[PDB]
Each structure stands twice: as structure tokens, then as C-alpha cells.
């Protein structure tokens, strides 16, 4: 049965483009990052402003939660990542090493490691406790648009404008597999699926694809949206109907049926590119965020 996501709250406060929103694993909070150099924390269910976290010298392209909902990591144009204690709002560590904008980041499930991708075309693996880089992977031949650990942290998937998705062995940093397209469009986002066996990849030819990791081939293709210019997050929605969720450059949130690939909803309201969406871990709630003409985050709820 098709979802009926409806706008419940609009979250204002950032002063430039929002870049990324993420729900805490415990379901309590939403974190947002922005080109305004700030991270903001909001109540996950009602969008209530909680706090602002500051320290980066330039704008931020991504933020991510640790598994216990206590830490954040952010990726900044200032060429660093920062690890934050959410409760105090203080910077615990500044991760230095990248030679150009840091674009994407994630903790592993154990949350002892952070992975980052940068416009310097590398992927780095960092130790959370020491704040020091463990491995630098010569991952790609163009900017790295996304990085994500699998469900036991043993694998990292990375994507790049070079047209490749690569899967890396976390422990050794060595490449296990490269996912290949003849037509080779820039890859703007990748993420492992909730069951651990698929990878969802966005390409800048208005397409999302679900890849079978084991077989190294595409299973599902999702189209209808607009995506040629920005690295827009995408998600698996699993709390109710099994959907794929993405932002779009026509200012809409798109929701597809994972199995049938049919568009089941388009959420209207934003007035600029929807750069980021996230799905609540237990409730049927979507967060979306938009670029500079809008600069708000919206919370949508569905009955199913």
C-alpha cells in the first residue's frame, strides 16, 4: 500500500545551503550540516531545535552519527573532519590529512573507525580514539562522492565521478571488487542495503541503481527524478513499505517501490534542490533538506 508522507514540520535556522541530514540510531535526534559551517541538532519527531555545534573554519558537506548516538563526525571544505561529543557540543578530535575538501564520512558499526572521502580523490580510514589516520586508499581518479561501511564494518564501499564504485577490505585497505558501467556516468552516491547484500548507487544521469554486490551486477533501476549536478543522498526506507527515497534537482523528494521501481510518491514543498533525505530508524518519518534558496529541513510522516 502506497505511502502518504505529509509535511509535519519545517526546521529553519541554517543561513546557507543545508548539505546533509541524518537520524540518530536511537531515533531521538536529527543532525544537519550546512555550508554555513554549522551542525544543528533537532528533535527527530517534532523538529524541535536542540543545539548548534560549531568549530569548522569552512562549510560542511556531510555529518554522521556513531552507533551509540553519542558522537558525530563532520566533513568540511577546511580539509578536515571533526569528531564531536553530541552532549557537550565540543570537538574531540580534528582529523587532518586530506589535501582538498572532505566530502563524505561515516562511522563503522563498532564506531571505532571513521571512513572519509575527499575531492583529493582518496579514501581515508581513521581511528576514532586517537584521531589519527590509519590508512590512505588511492581509491579513485576523480572526487570521492560517498563512503559507507557494511553491516559488520569489514567492507567499505566508495563512489566517484570517475564512474566507479569500489568495495574495499577495511582491515587491509585493499580493493575487493570494482563495479563497472560501459557508459560510465559519474557516480554521486553509494550505500550498502539494510540486509547487507546490495549497494544502492546514484549516477549523474538521473538514475539510481540497486547492485547485487555478490554477482557484481545491476538488479533494479529507478528513474523519473532529476540528478545531473549534485551528490544527492538516497535511502532504503524499511520501517513500512519497502521504498527507495531520494532528493531531486526539481525540488521534490522521490519515493519508489523498491521491487517494482514505480514512483509511489513525490513530496512537494521545498523551493530549491533537495540535496539530502534520511529515514527514521523505527518510525515512518522522512527528513529532507534543501540548497541555498530554501535552506530548511522538512519532516514528513506517513501512516505506512
Amino acid at each position: 500500500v502506497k505511502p502518504n508522507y505529509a509535511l509535519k514540520f519545517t526546521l529553519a535556522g541554517h543561513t546557507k545551503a543545508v548539505s546533509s541530514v541524518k537520524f540518530s540510531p536511537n531515533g531521538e535526534w536529527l543532525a544537519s550540516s550546512s555550508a554555513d559551517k554549522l551542525i544543528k541538532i533537532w528533535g527527530a519527531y517534532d523538529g524541535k531545535f536542540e543545539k548548534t555545534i560549531s568549530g569548522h573554519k569552512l562549510g560542511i558537506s556531510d555529518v554522521a552519527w556513531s552507533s551509540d548516538s553519542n558522537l558525530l563526525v563532520s566533513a568540511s571544505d577546511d580539509k578536515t573532519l571533526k569528531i564531536w561529543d553530541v552532549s557537550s557540543g565540543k570537538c574531540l578530535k580534528t582529523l587532518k590529512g586530506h589535501s582538498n575538501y572532505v566530502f563524505c564520512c561515516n562511522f563503522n558499526p563498532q564506531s571505532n573507525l571513521i571512513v572519509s572521502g575527499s575531492f583529493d580523490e582518496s579514501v581515508r580510514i581513521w581511528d576514532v580514539k586517537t584521531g589519527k589516520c590509519l590508512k590512505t586508499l588511492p581509491a579513485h581518479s576523480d572526487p570521492v562522492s560517498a563512503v559507507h561501511f557494511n553491516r559488520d564494518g569489514s567492507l567499505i564501499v566508495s563512489s566517484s565521478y570517475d564512474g566507479l564504485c569500489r568495495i574495499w577490505d577495511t582491515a587491509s585497505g585493499q580493493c575487493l571488487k570494482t563495479l563497472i558501467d560501459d557508459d560510465n556516468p559519474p557516480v554521486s552516491f553509494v550505500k550498502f542495503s539494510p540486509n547487507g547484500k546490495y549497494i544502492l548507487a546514484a549516477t549523474l544521469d538521473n538514475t539510481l541503481k540497486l547492485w547485487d554486490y555478490s554477482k557484481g551486477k545491476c538488479l533494479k533501476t529507478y528513474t523519473g527524478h532529476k540528478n545531473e549536478k549534485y551528490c544527492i543522498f538516497a535511502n532504503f526506507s524499511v520501517t513500512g513499505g519497502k521504498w527507495i527515497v531520494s532528493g531531486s534537482e526539481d525540488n521534490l523528494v522521490y519515493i519508489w517501490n523498491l521491487q517494482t521501481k514505480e514512483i509511489v510518491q513525490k513530496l512537494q514543498g521545498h523551493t530549491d534542490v533537495v540535496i539530502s533525505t534520511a529515514c527514521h530508524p523505527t518510525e515512518n518519518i522522512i527528513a529532507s533538506a534543501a540548497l541555498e534558496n530554501d535552506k530548511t529541513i522538512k519532516l514528513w510522516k506517513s501512516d505506512c
Binding site: 546557507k16 555550508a35 562549510g59 560542511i60 575538501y101 549536478k229 549534485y230
Partner: peptide, 14 residues
């Protein structure tokens, strides 16, 4: 610099 303030909000060049 990225005129919009961060890499992700900057449109990709050809």
C-alpha cells in the same frame, strides 16, 4: 573556494 560555501552545494562542472 566553493562560492556556495561547501563542496556538496556547488554544482558539478562539466
Amino acid at each position: 573556494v566553493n562560492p556556495t560555501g561547501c563542496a556538496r552545494s556547488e554544482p558539478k562542472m562539466s
